[PDB]
Design a protein around this ligand. Structure first.
Ligand code: YPV
Ligand code: YPV
Ligand code: CA
Lengths: 409, 410
């Protein structure tokens, strides 16, 4: 059976059955992550996806400078982060919490108030069972912190667990705790029915809020920085009115956030789900940032749930995660979340400035022009000279870039 | 001048400045994607992230069987997809559309009605110029299909463009078209002001709806399949009541969807943004699937916006994307979206069945027992033999798995 075959046997079988070509088999064999690691981490393993990784520059958070590992396939994301970080100069923490959530959900509950009374008088025993079900997190100074109770639909009761999982994302800790407590619940309440017991990825107790305050002159190379700031404010407010913009606005933010999450070995689906769900405010999907003009400064703020990890999951077992974490110089998960939120705000700034100025299309083209200048051998003032001239005609390629460079030499 | 340096020079500089260790530099150098490709795709390039890729099994969509490339770092995702697909047996398309969206947004509009009237009488010219701004897509049978107009509070007007981008995701086509039309708008309306012109990732005209119908006996190896089906229906209903569950429910779906999107070289942020926004219904974030009982069958349905690509972006320039596409063997992007939506529904089925039965933790450990057996060298009948013995006691690691394997071989 395929599940029980070695990776080599799996690839040989796919080729034999005509499901992949010999060239595809050879490419699937071209890997850099150890086969033993890859085949351990997932099931039915055959190969890997390689996502380019680069370095985001100029980010400063609470007066500490960072070099940001960013894994993405999308052109201009990393250059845009670097551009936004450089404009903003620095980011400051406004607020931060870090707890992870789980739930045990009962169903067919005749009297939710009565069930809640029986749970609430037993909270000390629940906390003791939570520790017994995962003792190591308590030893390390974390563990269950709070129990909350919600009733739904005259049938359901959610017992909400708020847990300090220290530097892990917390799925294994929380799920082990919940399974152990659910076993005790089944002993105590043999006639109540538990539907499921599972983590929640909606990590509303891991929200971090970061801000920046930018002199408006930094928003343009000319004298119209205030008029750019006013337009950034309008574009950000427009995301609160039109979900077709809000989705794209937040997608841009996530181009930066997801790139760091992926590079550091964190779970990209969990961050995406928590951030996009948090975008729903007052019943409408809206932007995750706010931009306002205060005096002669453009003020930006982001607020996102970032239950990120510096240990566990794929943060250590994948060697590239460890390499990215060395570059980023962060071992504390609270700090990781502050940095990642700042990346999202810097990314959004670069996007909004471009959108309301030359446009993102022209912004991409300017990056392409500079790349072409560098590829054909321009150095120093030559790079900006070739790139600026490339921008004056619509067709750009290496032949034209070299002709410009050689004409200038 | 980090953007000008070569990748090797970048890594040497980071080492020289004490920002990375020698061991980190060596690991960053351990790469399988061509440096020339990686350095041209992104900026400030130094290395790559490697995401394990496996094969999701048993998926059938509209009576065609598939083998699904899935790139993920999370244990159990691929085996869970395979389990859900096997239980479901097959998926059927309910409906599908495929158009991409962009917008030109005007601001400080004194009279939105008058502006819309002036644009609407000029649609032929808008259609003529959208072609001129990207003629290849029209030559290929695509292009602009519809213009819509929305006015807002605070003096904004959005001109909405609905575009057939054929097998591309469409960012380059749509953004080029919008830029060219915006130039024409500026010539026409000197007193109006355009705030921006950009695609929308909220691809509500690329929604696909897929369904499955499952005899309830298939939900348990015992005689209680109907009772499992009832609990799946209630767990799915609960996601309509509690956003704390809905987010996790949809995250599970996206473990499967994102794995295929990533493996095929598609943009994972775009799919995540469109799918999670689409989860908002009647002002509340809810599940992307529905499960009901009808005719002693468990009936599941998913509906997601999937503006996916089989050309462009990273679908061809990354060799692993082409390898994944060979394995998957879809004919066009519409078919890719149908398969990916079916993956999401199969994933959700496997998750809900486990949640209401033995629990996800027990399901993870059963898979870990087999994985440990294979990691230490078990083959054939040894895989299940080692795994079954591992589950009889508490310690789940490689040392114990190897001790069992060597003992069984004595
Ligand atoms: C210094 C470069 C200037 C131009 C530029 C700016 C940003 C990006 N990347 S982005 O922020 O990820 C991004 C991409 C596409 C988008 O549509 C959006 C959005 O609409 O908000 C955001 C790319 C180019
Ligand atoms: C045959 C395996 C049986 C057990 C099992 C089933 C599914 C998965 N993966 S999953 O669907 O991606 C997923 C993971 C974690 C989750 O909390 C959820 C959710 O809550 O919906 C979903 C893993 C294990
Ligand atoms: Ca079916």
């Amino acid at each position: 059976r395929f599940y029980q075959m070695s990776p080599e046997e799996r690839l040989a079988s796919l080729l034999n059955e005509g499901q992949i070509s010999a060239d595809t088999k050879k490419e699937f064999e071209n890997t850099a992550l150890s086969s033993q690691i890859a085949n351990h981490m997932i099931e039915n393993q055959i190969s890997e996806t390689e996502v380019p990784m680069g370095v985001g520059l100029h980010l400063t958070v609470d007066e500490t400078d960072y070099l940001v590992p960013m894994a993405t396939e999308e052109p201009s994301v990393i250059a845009a982060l670097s551009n936004g970080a450089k404009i903003a100069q620095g980011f400051k923490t406004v607020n931060q919490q870090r707890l992870m959530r789980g739930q045990i959900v009962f169903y067919d509950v005749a009297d939710p108030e009565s069930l809640i009374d029986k749970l609430q008088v037993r909270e000390a025993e629940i906390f003791q069972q939570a520790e017994l079900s995962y003792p190591s997190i308590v030893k390390r100074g974390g563990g269950l912190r709070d129990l909350q109770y919600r009733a739904f639909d005259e049938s359901f009761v959610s017992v909400d667990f708020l847990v300090d999982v220290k530097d892990a994302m917390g799925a294994n800790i929380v799920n082990a705790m919940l399974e152990g407590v659910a076993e005790l619940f089944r002993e105590w309440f043999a006639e109540q029915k538990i539907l499921f017991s599972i983590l929640s990825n909606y990590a509303t107790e891991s929200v971090v809020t970061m801000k920046t305050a930018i002199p408006v002159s930094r928003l343009s190379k000319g004298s119209n920085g205030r008029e750019i700031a006013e337009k950034i404010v309008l574009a950000s407010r427009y995301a609160s009115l039109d979900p077709y913009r809000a989705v794209t606005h937040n997608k841009g933010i996530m181009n930066g956030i997801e790139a760091v999450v992926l590079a550091t070995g964190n779970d990209t689906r969990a961050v995406s789900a928590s951030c996009h769900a948090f975008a729903v405010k007052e019943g409408r999907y809206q932007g995750l940032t706010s931009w306002t003009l205060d005096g002669e400064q453009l003020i930006g703020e982001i607020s996102v749930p970032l239950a990120l990890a510096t240990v566990g999951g794929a943060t250590k077992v994948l060697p590239k995660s460890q390499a990215a974490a060395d570059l980023l110089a962060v071992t504390d998960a609270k700090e990781l979340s502050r940095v990642v939120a700042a990346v999202g705000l810097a990314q959004n700034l670069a996007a909004l400035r471009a959108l309301v100025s030359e446009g993102i299309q022209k912004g991409h083209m300017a990056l392409q022009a500079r790349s072409l200048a560098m590829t054909v051998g321009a150095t120093g003032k030559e790079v900006e000279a070739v790139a600026q001239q490339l921008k004056r005609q619509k067709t750009m390629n290496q032949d034209r870039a070299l002709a410009i460079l050689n004409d200038l030499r």
